Amino acid sequence: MRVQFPTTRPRRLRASKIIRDAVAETQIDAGDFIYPLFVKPGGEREPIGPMPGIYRWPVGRELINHVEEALSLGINKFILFGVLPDELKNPEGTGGYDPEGVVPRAIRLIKEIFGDRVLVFADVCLCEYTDHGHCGVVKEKRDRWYVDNDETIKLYAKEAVVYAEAGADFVAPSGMMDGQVREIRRALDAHGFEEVGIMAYSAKYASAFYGPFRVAAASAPKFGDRRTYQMDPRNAYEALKEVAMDLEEGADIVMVKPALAYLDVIRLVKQHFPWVPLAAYNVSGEYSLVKAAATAGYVDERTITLEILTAIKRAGADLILTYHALEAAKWIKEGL
Amino acid sequence: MRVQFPTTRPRRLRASKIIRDAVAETQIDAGDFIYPLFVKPGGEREPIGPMPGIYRWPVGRELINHVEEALSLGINKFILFGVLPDELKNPEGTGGYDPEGVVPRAIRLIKEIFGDRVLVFADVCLCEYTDHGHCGVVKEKRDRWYVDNDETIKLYAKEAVVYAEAGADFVAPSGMMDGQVREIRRALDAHGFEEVGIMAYSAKYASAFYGPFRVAAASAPKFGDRRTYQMDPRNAYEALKEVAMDLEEGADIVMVKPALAYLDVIRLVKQHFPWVPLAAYNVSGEYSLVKAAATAGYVDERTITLEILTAIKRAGADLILTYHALEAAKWIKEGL
Amino acid sequence: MRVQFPTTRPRRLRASKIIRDAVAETQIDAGDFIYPLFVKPGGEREPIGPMPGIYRWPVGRELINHVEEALSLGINKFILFGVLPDELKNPEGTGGYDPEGVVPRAIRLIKEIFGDRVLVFADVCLCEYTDHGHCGVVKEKRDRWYVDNDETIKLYAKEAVVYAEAGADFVAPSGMMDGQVREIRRALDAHGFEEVGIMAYSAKYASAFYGPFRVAAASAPKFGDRRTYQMDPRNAYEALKEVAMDLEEGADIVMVKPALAYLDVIRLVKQHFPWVPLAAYNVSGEYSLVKAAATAGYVDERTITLEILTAIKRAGADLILTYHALEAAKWIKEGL
Amino acid sequence: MRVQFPTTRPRRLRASKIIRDAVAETQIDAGDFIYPLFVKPGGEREPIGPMPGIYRWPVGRELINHVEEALSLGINKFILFGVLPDELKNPEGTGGYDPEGVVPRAIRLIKEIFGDRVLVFADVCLCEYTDHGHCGVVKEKRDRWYVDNDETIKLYAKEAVVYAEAGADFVAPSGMMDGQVREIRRALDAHGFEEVGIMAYSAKYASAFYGPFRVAAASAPKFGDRRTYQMDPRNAYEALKEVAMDLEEGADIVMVKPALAYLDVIRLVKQHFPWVPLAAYNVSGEYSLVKAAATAGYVDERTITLEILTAIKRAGADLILTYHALEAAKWIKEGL
Amino acid sequence: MRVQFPTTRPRRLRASKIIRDAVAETQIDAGDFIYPLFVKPGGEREPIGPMPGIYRWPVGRELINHVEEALSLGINKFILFGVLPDELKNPEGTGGYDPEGVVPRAIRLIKEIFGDRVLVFADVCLCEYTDHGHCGVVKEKRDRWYVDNDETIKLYAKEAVVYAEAGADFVAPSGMMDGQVREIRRALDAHGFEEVGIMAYSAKYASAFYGPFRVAAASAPKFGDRRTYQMDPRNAYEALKEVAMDLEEGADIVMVKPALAYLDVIRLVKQHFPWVPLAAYNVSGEYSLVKAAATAGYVDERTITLEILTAIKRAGADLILTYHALEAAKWIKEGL
Amino acid sequence: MRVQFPTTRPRRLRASKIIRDAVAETQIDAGDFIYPLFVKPGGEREPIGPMPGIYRWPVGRELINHVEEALSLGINKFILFGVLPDELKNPEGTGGYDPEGVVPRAIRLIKEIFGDRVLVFADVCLCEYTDHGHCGVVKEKRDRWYVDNDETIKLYAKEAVVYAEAGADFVAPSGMMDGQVREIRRALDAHGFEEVGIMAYSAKYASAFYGPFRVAAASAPKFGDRRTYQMDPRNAYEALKEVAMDLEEGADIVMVKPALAYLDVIRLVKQHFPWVPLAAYNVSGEYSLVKAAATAGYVDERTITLEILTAIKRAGADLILTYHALEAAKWIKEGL
Ligand SMILES: [Zn+2]
Ligand SMILES: [Zn+2]
Ligand SMILES: [Zn+2]
Ligand SMILES: [Zn+2]
Ligand SMILES: [Zn+2]
Ligand SMILES: [Zn+2]
Ligand SMILES: [Zn+2]
Ligand SMILES: [Zn+2]
Ligand SMILES: [Zn+2]
Ligand SMILES: [Zn+2]
Ligand SMILES: [Zn+2]
Ligand SMILES: [Zn+2]
Numbered sequence A, B, C, D, E, F: 001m002r003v004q005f006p007t008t009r010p011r012r013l014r015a016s017k018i019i020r021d022a023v024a025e026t027q028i029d030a031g032d033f034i035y036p037l038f039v040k041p042g043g044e045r046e047p048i049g050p051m052p053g054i055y056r057w058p059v060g061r062e063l064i065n066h067v068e069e070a071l072s073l074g075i076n077k078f079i080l081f082g083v084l085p086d087e088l089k090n091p092e093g094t095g096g097y098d099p100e101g102v103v104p105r106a107i108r109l110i111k112e113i114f115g116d117r118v119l120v121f122a123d124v125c126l127c128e129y130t131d132h133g134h135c136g137v138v139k140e141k142r143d144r145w146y147v148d149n150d151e152t153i154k155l156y157a158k159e160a161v162v163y164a165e166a167g168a169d170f171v172a173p174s175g176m177m178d179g180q181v182r183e184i185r186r187a188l189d190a191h192g193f194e195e196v197g198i199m200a201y202s203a204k205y206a207s208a209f210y211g212p213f214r215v216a217a218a219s220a221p222k223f224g225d226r227r228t229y230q231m232d233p234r235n236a237y238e239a240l241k242e243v244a245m246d247l248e249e250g251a252d253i254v255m256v257k258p259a260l261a262y263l264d265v266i267r268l269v270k271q272h273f274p275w276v277p278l279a280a281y282n283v284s285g286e287y288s289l290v291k292a293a294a295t296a297g298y299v300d301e302r303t304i305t306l307e308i309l310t311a312i313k314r315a316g317a318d319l320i321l322t323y324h325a326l327e328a329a330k331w332i333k334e335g336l
Helices: A010-014 A017-023 A062-071 A103-117 A149-166 A180-190 A208-217 A238-248 A263-270 A284-295 A301-315 A325-329 B017-023 B063-072 B102-111 B150-166 B180-191 B208-217 B238-249 B260-270 B284-295 B301-315 B325-330 C017-023 C061-072 C102-113 C149-166 C180-190 C238-249 C260-272 C284-295 C301-315 C325-330 D017-023 D061-072 D103-117 D149-166 D180-189 D208-217 D238-248 D260-272 D284-295 D301-315 E010-014 E017-022 E064-073 E103-117 E149-166 E180-190 E211-217 E238-248 E260-270 E284-295 E301-315 E325-329 F017-023 F061-072 F102-112 F149-166 F180-190 F211-217 F238-248 F260-272 F284-295 F301-315 F325-330
Strands: A033-040 A055-058 A077-082 A119-124 A170-173 A197-204 A253-257 A278-280 A319-321 B033-040 B056-058 B077-082 B119-124 B138-141 B144-147 B170-173 B197-204 B253-257 B278-282 B319-322 C033-040 C055-058 C077-082 C119-124 C138-140 C145-147 C170-173 C197-204 C253-257 C278-282 C319-322 D033-040 D055-058 D077-082 D119-124 D170-173 D197-204 D253-257 D278-280 E033-040 E055-058 E077-082 E119-124 E137-140 E145-148 E170-173 E197-204 E253-257 E278-282 E319-322 F033-040 F055-058 F077-082 F119-124 F137-139 F146-148 F170-173 F197-204 F253-257 F278-281 F319-321
Touching: A010 A017, A010 B238, A017 C119, A033 A062, A033 A103, A033 A325, A055 A062, A062 A103, A062 A325, A077 A103, A077 C017, A103 A119, A103 A149, A103 C017, A119 A149, A119 C017, A149 A170, A149 A180, A170 A180, A180 A197, A180 A238, A197 A238, A208 A284, A208 B301, A238 A253, A238 A263, A253 A263, A253 A319, A263 A278, A263 A301, A263 B260, A263 B301, A284 A301, A284 B284, A301 A319, A301 A325, A301 B208, A301 B260, B017 E119, B033 B063, B033 B102, B033 B325, B063 B102, B063 B325, B077 B102, B102 B119, B102 B150, B119 B150, B119 E017, B150 B170, B150 B180, B170 B180, B180 B197, B180 B238, B197 B238, B197 B260, B197 B278, B208 B284, B238 B253, B238 B260, B253 B260, B253 B319, B260 B278, B260 B301, B278 B301, B284 B301, B301 B319, B301 B325, C033 C061, C033 C102, C033 C325, C055 C061, C061 C102, C061 C325, C077 C102, C102 C119, C102 C149, C119 C149, C149 C170, C149 C180, C170 C180, C180 C197, C180 C238, C197 C238, C197 C260, C238 C253, C238 C260, C253 C260, C253 C319, C260 C278, C260 C301, C260 D260, C260 D301, C278 C301, C284 C301, C284 D284, C301 C319, C301 C325, C301 D208, C301 D260, D033 D061, D033 D103, D055 D061, D061 D103, D077 D103, D077 D208, D103 D119, D103 D149, D119 D149, D149 D170, D149 D180, D170 D180, D180 D197, D197 D238, D197 D260, D208 D284, D238 D253, D238 D260, D253 D260, D260 D278, D260 D301, D284 D301, E010 E017, E010 F238, E033 E064, E033 E103, E033 E325, E064 E103, E064 E325, E077 E103, E077 E211, E103 E119, E103 E149, E119 E149, E137 E149, E145 E149, E149 E170, E149 E180, E170 E180, E180 E197, E197 E238, E197 E260, E211 E284, E238 E253, E238 E260, E253 E260, E253 E319, E260 E278, E260 E301, E260 F260, E260 F301, E278 E301, E284 E301, E284 F284, E301 E319, E301 E325, E301 F260, E319 E325, F033 F061, F033 F102, F033 F325, F055 F061, F061 F102, F061 F325, F077 F102, F077 F211, F102 F119, F102 F149, F119 F149, F137 F149, F146 F149, F149 F170, F149 F180, F170 F180, F180 F197, F197 F238, F197 F260, F211 F284, F238 F253, F238 F260, F253 F260, F253 F319, F260 F278, F260 F301, F284 F301, F301 F319, F301 F325
Parallel strands: A033 A055, A033 A077, A033 A319, A077 A119, A119 A170, A170 A197, A197 A253, A253 A278, A278 A319, B033 B056, B033 B077, B033 B319, B077 B119, B119 B170, B170 B197, B197 B253, B253 B278, B278 B319, C033 C055, C033 C077, C033 C319, C077 C119, C119 C170, C170 C197, C197 C253, C253 C278, C278 C319, D033 D055, D033 D077, D077 D119, D119 D170, D170 D197, D197 D253, D253 D278, E033 E055, E033 E077, E033 E319, E077 E119, E119 E170, E170 E197, E197 E253, E253 E278, E278 E319, F033 F055, F033 F077, F033 F319, F077 F119, F119 F170, F170 F197, F197 F253, F253 F278, F278 F319
Antiparallel strands: B138 B144, C138 C145, E137 E145, F137 F146
């Protein structure tokens, strides 16, 4: 850029909202969001401690309130999460594959009464359904403990096929187990579900930003370490290897969890794989950080959230996984 | 990445701590920090609410109280923002360019007494020193108002040369006025300050994350927004234009502000000007956001500020300005 | 690609209306449109037969009425075109820089009444304001006629500086005359208008698609050929020099006329100048093709108008000029 | 660049048709073209005034009529389409794989009467030959309706092998069914037609421009909406992955349908696959659009048809499928 | 680099140890070192002639009374080279696969007492273990003397399996035999050690900087050279292939050997494989070179060894194999 | 890089000396060497202990016989370095720019009894001729000592005009003062030496590899670091700014000193400025290191010093400055 002052004034293009908006590089809208719904196996509906305004819906008319409202705001794609009582959690997380489950009743339900007016994403992991709360089967092999890869993946394979049968449009493995997309695809495709798609949590990072979702889903270990499956957050370039394998194995969409502390990684993923669609999870504690600081007084809650989503899109995410979606979607007239 | 499962299992590199540390793309230390000091004539220490624990020191023994504390931790670079009473602000900003004003008094104090034991960056702006809260001279053309450019640039020059005359090692224009780097670098070269550097706040954005600052600086704009000179969070590639021109003008170091919600932009700049040092400002807000969540339950203050500051490095920043600085430095045992 | 069938099924993402929208690369709105107004000295709104729908509005209530229309549909960006009768046309151009002629009044009216809720681009040429209709001063040098650059350049500087006074946010030169942008920028900078912005028709081509413009503005070359000055349509890369020079000269926005038939150029410019706002002109004729073919049986109007505007976006343009502007902006019902 | 007015004047190279023709980046000719022949079983020369210009040829004595003319102008490539009545179409589409069908008899003939003096492409789709009108076999997977991917490929195999036998030099799938190239290949290879090559419509877009070729072959659809196979026109980068698969899978030439509206794609595909050849079908509508504006006076049919064909060439296209071909061919005086 | 003098004065970033360290591109700490231990069956510490200051340790109680001292300074990663009395040395090399060898003892020992507080790599080659001292197994075709690639490769497999059996975290094939990685990778997986990892001497040059190590290990060749396996020094680009092939093969870490004299290759590989963690070997007599010259008078031992270690980093290396590391690490204040 | 073992066996190309030689990316001849001569005033061939092998030749038979012998080995180009004692040194460094000095006599002589048969680079720097050993002029302004950039740089232009007049083909500035090549080519051009070229020591690192030369020449600085003018070895990319400025300023040849421990900077520099011819200085320490390692036979002095030199080629350097020039030019028969 051998443009030069004062012949060229960058500020001409910031003289007025009507112009900044014309020449703006990024744009958001409600379609870019996926809303996550927490689903518990009948009962009351429960407020969620870390996550203001977010709830754990039992699988009923709690739809009426929420999936239909969200639709009437523009949000029309959803990702579902099992949240159990400890009383049905076993060290090989049977929860995940139980057609009379939690989530597969939620899927069945929503997809019955809404049909193709919605798209349902379905989380594929054991950490919401295991005794110990890691994302897989453990092996007390005679040295030390570790979440064993090759048996834990076949559990994800079953997990998927339940939801595929129950009618979910997408399946989306968050395990960070290697070969996960491989052994799912080959499940699905063997059970005649070529129609079903896979959105891989491919570059999922070992983050403190999960604090709230651990509380809000039950998932939370008893030997407290993700670090031997979730990516080391010092590593950006590592993420390319992970997106590339998760693509040869045949995922359809790819993502980066969390987003806000990883925007640099989104743009490095997006610009080596332009042809891929790219999602990104405005995660658990990126929410409650805003909210903490919004009410405790510090930051205009409206602006700072749209600033934080415009950021995620600007980096290069095509789809964003916010718990905000709804309260962001009536945001229809932004400051930027 | 013509690479398969199960021949290469990415988790081999995740599996120890000794190894993840062995292979980690990024690392960080207290050399990388720049701690900001708030500074005032007042005579009485004065706490910033929406911080906190960051105070508005008067020019006295924040010396061999506080700068000397910061130093003992490996933190030897400081940026000064002067603050003051509405009593002594006018529309043309004088308190800035004023040999006897706050910042100069402080610069001279800190230099004469540490000396070359530390660096002293000096913010150059008029937001802390004006009547209207804005960063330049204001005018009216007809329908509307504006911050006239080339009349304020000249004021930045005076400030720059006032703080240089006092001892300043670098001058750092925060205004986003066009041309300023060059009107500073020249006015400086003229007064015999070839030896004084310029750290340009090159790509600084119209952010909602500044809230806490304006209270810390008595600098909130008393009418309207800054969206008329600070960049449009919508825009990444715009910052390659802004950084290029600042380099051509004589900027020794170039920065991205705010840092956390613009990591994509850090990396974009850095992957383009590999040969320039790149600063990043972990702002007023991404401290206040954190201390908020921290206080009110949601997150581990320690592990999430070191995820956040590490994220800033990984994207590309060589230096970080942060109000954590001191606390982050005793985090001298790497939890990742 | 390390990507094979059946493992990867590219149709998965084409499966529903809902996911196709999800992963789509491109999009549109009235925010992206620059609607032209054809403005005339006095009388009636004359219909313009080769371009059904768009009349020639007489500068006054009936116009400024029709601009509220545009504004209620989201459109807030107008490029002003002066048309006037034979009797006021002459060899060296007059009307164009007659301070209370056609377009100055139009600029003013629209600014005074709406002002900072609406952006005004003002075209800078001598086609609509000359005897011959050629876009510059015509000279004779012992061979044949030729359109003189450096004396027509000068006349633009006069035209731009007039519209500048009248209140125009932007000036936009369509003459393809060399160094035009710099003369306009130096004039404007000299007569006080550093605030005022230039949008070069940098890469305007010698197309057949302008015919119905020369019926709307009576710009018809009374003899000969634009080809002496407008770009040779065999040349894609030639337009990288045309952009690059206009950018050094001091342009702010850059465009490519026509648009539909030069989509590959739009990509080529945009991928060499990611940091520059690009625009593009869905012209005089590309509308007149969609109309004549639709009007007479051959293709659906609202799908082909939309599909064509979705192109220009996809090809690269942040802004599209179109005489489809409004009808496409009520196409909020995105049919793909 | 480093290239400046007035020292460099672009217009020196615009100032005569003798240097514009010298420095021109692009050329065209009959050699570049590929002429479609709509063929039908028994009847008169049925006119396609839904276009118009083009006719529907009765397989037999009116090759002289056409092919032998075209060839006299240097048009020596032909892609064959088939038209049948409703009495002769069924849900599996047997028009295709019937050696005394329409399209296989037209091959025998022209290959018999001309030999290697004229190359012959054959269209491999069911849309001309099914009673629904869809490009594939329709199904009803327990719930909604769809076009079965794997099953409809295996018909395209039979079609291709039938047309190989019957005499085609090349074959061309346009169903956009994933794997079409792979299976048409193995079929052809293992009936010893490794000689015979595949011109994949590998980036066919779901376009409003086909309206005419619907009324030219009776291939419009009953439960109608092609968006589940034919591409999402928001998508350019999609097309790299869609081409790059058809190359692995053994395609020979790669193409983009439509052309005019997707020139931006062409440049993208060609700059990523410089080594593969690349055609682009100038559509039924892009031809018709021009004609109906020619009807009602808005453009010079001759200029705007050479301007369009010279643009597809400009973009990257090696070959061009055009209904103009025969007009375009006898324009031997390049009017630009 | 459009930057010009005197307005840009590159010396401003060299004026102060503060600011010179601020903008420093590169950094070092013990966490980058892998220290090599020479292990012998018994007796005492033989000092090593050429490498003044390293000993051959007996697999005794100077494990800890070196390895414990290594730990303290901050060096926790070791690579284990065996050193045999050449009674136990044959043409097939049978210290390599002997479970009660030296290397297997010292693995079994160090991990017994240090556990996963220390990482342990084993060297895998047969120059320490054959009577002829070649890295593989010799043969004679119609040729003469030649190291057999495909037989010898199987012994590295047998060697590695043992070292994992004995308990090594990692394994490292230095023979430069082709395809050596998936032959070692398929043993390890096929004997359940999915968890063990491979640091691959990918680009290991045929160098004279090994003079000292040949003496420390008894690994000198009795005949011929290493040139028919180890890389030819003239070639940088050959090392991309050699790396790229070892990463398809299942490798984890990838080194260039030796280092100082092949830094241009270290940058060349790191810039083609940014996602892959790259090691490098500050090799036998890159250390004896320094150690000689320091006694000799000529050069400063401290700064020259840190300049050389900083170098191998500044290039790329994420890990350095060095015989300095211990004395290196207690340099805790920067030369540069 | 989709070669796969065992189909592709890298070792085929290492088979024999001939095939290695056949494919080798790099070569040497003595054409690439530039031999330095330390030249002293008072007649007495004085040996150099921290070399050794090199002398302080006095200007006469002894010297001119040395170069006579050089040329015979093909060493046909030299760089002259003036050594002289503590009487002829002084703060401003006069010694350097006296035309009856050593270095201007040494030139004129070689030029007399050789002329066009030989090329003579002249080093331009005050560190050989000052009281204090610094490469420029010290100023003790305030209470910090600092080498003054704009005052030393005029005295470089003197020294330069002087050697140009003695008959030097090239002039080469090694002081790393900024704007030096500019100052030197304005002076040469003014006194009418437009054909006298400049080889800048563009990117000269502050090394510990220089201690032997400090002894040879007496450049040993009496007080302090060279750190404030020499490049920090931590930085590679900083080199490109340094070269690109030296090119714009008028350089012809560009160098990177030292070489061995900066091969990586050579590749980085040479890949960005491929059209610039690049030299590299094999230094004082990279000679004396080797010599000592050889003298206490740790490593083979013939193969190491061609291995070292072949590396400086492989990296990018078209010319190498060595003291091995001759002993390495005779070594006709390759390593390697
Ligand atoms: Zn989980
Ligand atoms: Zn994975
Ligand atoms: Zn400010
Ligand atoms: Zn700026
Ligand atoms: Zn015009
Ligand atoms: Zn132009
Ligand atoms: Zn079809
Ligand atoms: Zn396909
Ligand atoms: Zn070996
Ligand atoms: Zn290998
Ligand atoms: Zn010197
Ligand atoms: Zn320099």
